[PDB]
Amino acid sequence: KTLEVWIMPNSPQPAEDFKALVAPFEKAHGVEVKVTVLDWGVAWTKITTAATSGVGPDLTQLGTTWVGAISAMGVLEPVDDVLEALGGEKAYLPAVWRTTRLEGARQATAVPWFSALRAFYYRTDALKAAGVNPAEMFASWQGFEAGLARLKASSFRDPETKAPLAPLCTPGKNSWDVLHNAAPWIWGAGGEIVRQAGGRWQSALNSPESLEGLYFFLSLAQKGYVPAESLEKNTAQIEADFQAGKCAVFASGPWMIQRAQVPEAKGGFAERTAAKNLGVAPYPAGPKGRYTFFGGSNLALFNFSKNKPLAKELLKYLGGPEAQVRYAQMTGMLPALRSAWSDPSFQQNPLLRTFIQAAQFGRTYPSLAGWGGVENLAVQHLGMAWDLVAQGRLTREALKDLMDKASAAINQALR
Ligand SMILES: O=S([O-])[O-]
Numbered sequence: 001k002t003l004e005v006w007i008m009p010n011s012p013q014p015a016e017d018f019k020a021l022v023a024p025f026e027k028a029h030g031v032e033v034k035v036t037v038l039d040w041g042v043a044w045t046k047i048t049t050a051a052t053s054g055v056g057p058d059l060t061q062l063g064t065t066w067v068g069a070i071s072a073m074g075v076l077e078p079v080d081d082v083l084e085a086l087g088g089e090k091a092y093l094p095a096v097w098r099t100t101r102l103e104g105a106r107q108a109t110a111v112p113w114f115s116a117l118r119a120f121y122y123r124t125d126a127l128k129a130a131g132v133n134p135a136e137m138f139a140s141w142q143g144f145e146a147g148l149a150r151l152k153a154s155s156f157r158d159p160e161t162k163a164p165l166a167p168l169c170t171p172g173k174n175s176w177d178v179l180h181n182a183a184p185w186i187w188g189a190g191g192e193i194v195r196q197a198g199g200r201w202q203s204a205l206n207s208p209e210s211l212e213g214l215y216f217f218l219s220l221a222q223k224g225y226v227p228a229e230s231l232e233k234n235t236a237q238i239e240a241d242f243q244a245g246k247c248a249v250f251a252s253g254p255w256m257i258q259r260a261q262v263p264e265a266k267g268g269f270a271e272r273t274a275a276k277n278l279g280v281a282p283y284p285a286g287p288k289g290r291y292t293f294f295g296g297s298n299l300a301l302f303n304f305s306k307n308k309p310l311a312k313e314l315l316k317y318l319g320g321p322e323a324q325v326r327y328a329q330m331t332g333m334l335p336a337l338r339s340a341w342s343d344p345s346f347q348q349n350p351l352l353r354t355f356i357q358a359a360q361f362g363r364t365y366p367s368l369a370g371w372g373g374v375e376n377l378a379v380q381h382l383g384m385a386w387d388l389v390a391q392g393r394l395t396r397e398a399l400k401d402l403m404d405k406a407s408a409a410i411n412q413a414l415r
Pocket residue numbers: 347348349350
């Protein structure tokens with residue numbers, strides 16, 4: 001008696017980690033869980049083919065931003081029942097709960113599995129040497145920029161590189177997460193990517209507030225705070241640069257905390273100066289709010305499964321306390337289930353405690369069926385803004401004309 005699950009590579013040994021996660025469930029139910037690991041390069045197309053053909057697994061992982069699109073194809077089983085048995089809506093952050101359904105939909109089609117959230121890592125030694133107080137650097141945007149000006153002026157050299165640290169490392173346009181990097185700034189200025197008006201969704205990227213947050217973020221790169229080399233690279237490469245002592249400050253997820261403990265030999269950075277001088281702070285309070293970008297993944301049940309009762313039991317298991325703590329450990333993510341945040345594995349680690357403070361500002365995109373195309377069209381136009389930054393040519397006026405073009409393309413795709 002077997003269940004099939006599709007996952008993406010969430011942990012260092014994806015298949016082995018997941019088989020170890022579900023071993024107590026297999027024992028309690030006398031069943032085998034078969035897991036297939038889908039590379040992020042192919043997971044979407046594969047899940048899409050499963051949806052159209054009626055051929056696929058019992059359960060699939062979905063990126064949180066995938067929920068709307070797959071739910072709208074009519075192929076996912078309602079899991080309102082699973083979510084109630086896990087404690088219902090108030091068992092989750094509002095931003096995580098929004099990812100359980102197509103936006104506006106009556107029934108839940110996905111169970112929260114784990115959360116990817118971004119906070120700022122910083123070199124405690126570099127801020128010390130630049131005379132930057134971390135509380136002030138991360139309390140306002142003015143403080144954030146004043147902090148980067150002291151880090152730019154600083155004579156601090158990394159003990160290993162014997163070279164200056166870049167004040168801020170961030171990707172520009174050559175990364176999968178272009179929109180995610182900008183989102184906190186758009187939100188913090190009081191804006192948003194999409195808005196409801198006359199009862200339908202429209203681009204809000206050209207709103208006054210959205211443009212202010214975007215220009216604030218992008219102009220940091222234009223003022224000398226971000227290396228030109230950062231703008232050509234992806235998030236993984238920027239991670240590597242921070243580990244190798246080239247960056248004072250950069251946004252990433254909780255997984256860096258585990259990597260700081262792992263030898264270079266085994267793909268961690270324990271021996272690097274950065275590992276022993278690691279601070280974390282949430283994104284700084286904006287003038288019109290304070291927001292932490294949430295992503296990560298949920299689990300869903302194809303309505304063609306012949307094993308819905310056992311699959312729902314496995315959804316309750318994976319979504320529930322013990323597996324929530326266990327898989328967060330394996331993946332270096334935060335549990336989707338808020339009760340799992342009190343586990344000693346989190347509470348005994350001050351860096352994880354800071355990620356839990358960052359979690360209270362949690363915000364996600366609305367779960368639109370057409371979210372992919374909105375994000376893709378946004379990212380096309382943000383990329384052109386990053387090109388202007390790279391030349392020192394981004395003005396507020398030039399940013400507005402690109403986001404007006406973005407907004408016309410987005411509105412047509414939504415209309
Ligand atoms: O360092 S103590 O806060 O875990």
